[PDB]
Structures are given as C-alpha cells and as structure tokens.
Amino acid sequence: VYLDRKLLTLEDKELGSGNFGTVKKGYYQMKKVVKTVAVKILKPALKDELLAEANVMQQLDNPYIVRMIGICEAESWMLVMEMAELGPLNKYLQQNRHVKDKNIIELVHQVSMGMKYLEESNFVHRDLAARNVLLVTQHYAKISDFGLSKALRADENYYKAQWPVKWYAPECINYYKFSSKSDVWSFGVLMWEAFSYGQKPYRGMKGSEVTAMLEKGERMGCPAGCPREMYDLMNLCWTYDVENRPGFAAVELRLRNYYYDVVNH
Numbered sequence: 415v416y417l418d419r420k421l422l423t424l425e426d427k428e429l430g431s432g433n434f435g436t437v438k439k440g441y442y443q444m445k446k447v448v449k450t451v452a453v454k455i456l457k458p459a460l461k462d463e464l465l466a467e468a469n470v471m472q473q474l475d476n477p478y479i480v481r482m483i484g485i486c487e488a489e490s491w492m493l494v495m496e497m498a499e500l501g502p503l504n505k506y507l508q509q510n511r512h513v514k515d516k517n518i519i520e521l522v523h524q525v526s527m528g529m530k531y532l533e534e535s536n537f538v539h540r541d542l543a544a545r546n547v548l549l550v551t552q553h554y555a556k557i558s559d560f561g562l563s564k565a566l567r568a569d570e571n572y573y574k575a576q577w578p579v580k581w582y583a584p585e586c587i588n589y590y591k592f593s594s595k596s597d598v599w600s601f602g603v604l605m606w607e608a609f610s611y612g613q614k615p616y617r618g619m620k621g622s623e624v625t626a627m628l629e630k631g632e633r634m635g636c637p638a639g640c641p642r643e644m645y646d647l648m649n650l651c652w653t654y655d656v657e658n659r660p661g662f663a664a665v666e667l668r669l670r671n672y673y674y675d676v677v678n679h
C-alpha cells in the first residue's frame with residue numbers, strides 16, 4: 415500500500431480540488447510498465463480523513479469501483495488511484511449531448527452494479543452523485559470519491575453522523591442516519607442528472623427549500639426526452655419511507671431488464 419515518490423511523476427494537469435487540496439494527473443512506475451494515475455494531494459484531521467478513505471478503498475474489489483494503487487508520503491499525503499481518462503459523468507453528458515438513451519442506461523446500470531456490491535459489503539457511500547461517477551470509456555463507468563464513505567457497524571444497517579444535501583434522503587437530513595437505502599435515494603438523483611445531460615438537481619433552490627419540497631411529497635419533474643421507465647424508477651428511488659424504498663439488488667435488476675428492452679430497439 416506504500417508507494418515510492420521517486421516512481422511518481424505529477425503532471426501539470428488538475429482533475430479536481432477543495433478542501434483537502436487538489437487532484438492531479440500523474441504517472442506511476444510499476445514493476446515493469448508505467449500506470450496513468452489520479453493523485454489526491456492533501457494541502458491534522460485531513461490526514462486521518464485521507465487514511466480512512468485509503469482504508470475503505472483497500473477493502474473494495476469490484477469492476478465498477480475506482481481502484482486505489484496506494485498511498486504516498488512525500489511533500490504532502492497522497493492517495494494514488496487508477497485514472498478514468500473520460501472523467502465525470504455530469505461534465506461528459508454536458509459536453510456530449512448526442513449520447514443515446516441505451517448508453518446512459520448502460521452507464522447508470524454499471525453504477526447500480528457497483529452499488530449492489532457496496533451494499534453487500536455493508537459500506538455506505540454518502541456522496542453518490544453524477545460528478546462522482548467516472549468514465550473509463552464512453553461504455554464503462556466507475557464509482558469514485560469515498561471521502562464520506564463508512565463501513566457499517568456489525569449490529570446496525572445505518573451510520574449515524576455525530577454535506578451534498580440535494581443528493582441526501584430525508585432520513586439523512588432529519589436524523590443523520592445513512593444506510594444503503596439512503597444511497598438508493600442518491601442514485602435516483604444521479605439518474606435524474608444523467609437523463610438531464612448533467613444539469614444540477616433542484617436548480618436555484620436552497621437546501622431548506624429542497625427539504626420542504628420533499629416533505630410535501632413533491633419531486634423533480636421528468637427531464638425532457640427521458641424514458642418513462644427511467645423516470646418511474648427515479649420516483650421509486652425517491653420513496654420517503656426507508657422500509658418501502660428498494661435496495662440496490664432490486665434497482666440493478668430493473669435497470670438490467672430495461673436495458674435489454676432498449677438494446678433490442
């Protein structure tokens with residue numbers, strides 16, 4: 415897990431920031447080949463935050479989740495991850511307006527496969543948004559950004575916080591309780607983003623106005639040209655009651671079946 419700084423070259427290419435610090439493109443010399451990487455660079459609590467994120471990524475092994483190469487202790491603490499060259503899903507759809515519905519379905523279905531694995535592993539993501547979905551290719555999506563992620567206690571199906579509010583389920587906002595079903599709500603917001611060509615959800619609204627909207631039983635309207643089946647699935651992800659809301663196994667299956675209806679014209 416510990417990487418050699420002399421084997422890492424940081425490119426003059428920024429992929430993200432904050433916070434925290436910056437994300438830079440880089441190249442890491444492996445045992446024989448160089449690997450293209452994304453390097454999360456820290457610039458006291460922020461150190462433990464990065465190490466807990468590294469500890470979460472170390473435990474995960476699925477084709478639809480970004481792979482961590484390792485950690486690097488140098489000028490700054492660094493988290494070295496495999497590069498997804500096409501970048502975030504929202505930015506991609508904003509700039510590539512001719513992506514077919516079949517293709518958007520294929521991508522969000524891959525996200526649902528990665529989340530089904532996270533659900534089975536009893537980890538909660540807590541930052542599941544289109545900006546955190548990375549494209550390896552136009553037909554291959556991966557879940558990234560485990561900065562808010564938690565390993566659930568063995569005796570509880572939720573993490574209690576002691577925030578990307580527009581992606582959060584009511585139980586998160588009201589009770590600070592985060593479960594895999596809370597990630598399903600976020601997934602519904604992500605699907606809305608993907609079918610709105612990366613438009614931000616709840617445009618022009620304050621967090622408190624979003625809470626009020628949701629509590630009155632209101633939800634974002636159907637994106638122009640969105641398949642009805644996909645909008646219906648978003649509304650099922652947006653079930654107020656955690657108990658009636660589907661888990662990722664049920665979501666993955668519905669997306670998979672709908673994908674085959676679309677693939678076969």
Ligand SMILES: COc1cc(F)c(-c2nc3c(NCC4CCNCC4)c(Cl)cnc3[nH]2)cc1OC
Nearest residue numbers: 429430437452495496497498499500501545546
């Ligand atoms: C065309 O514009 C982009 C192309 C890119 F390839 C990338 C990129 N960023 C990462 C990345 N980390 C940072 C992103 C985590 C999710 N939230 C967004 C920033 C990691 Cl871990 C692995 N591959 C990545 N590819 C970013 C881009 O625009 C921000």
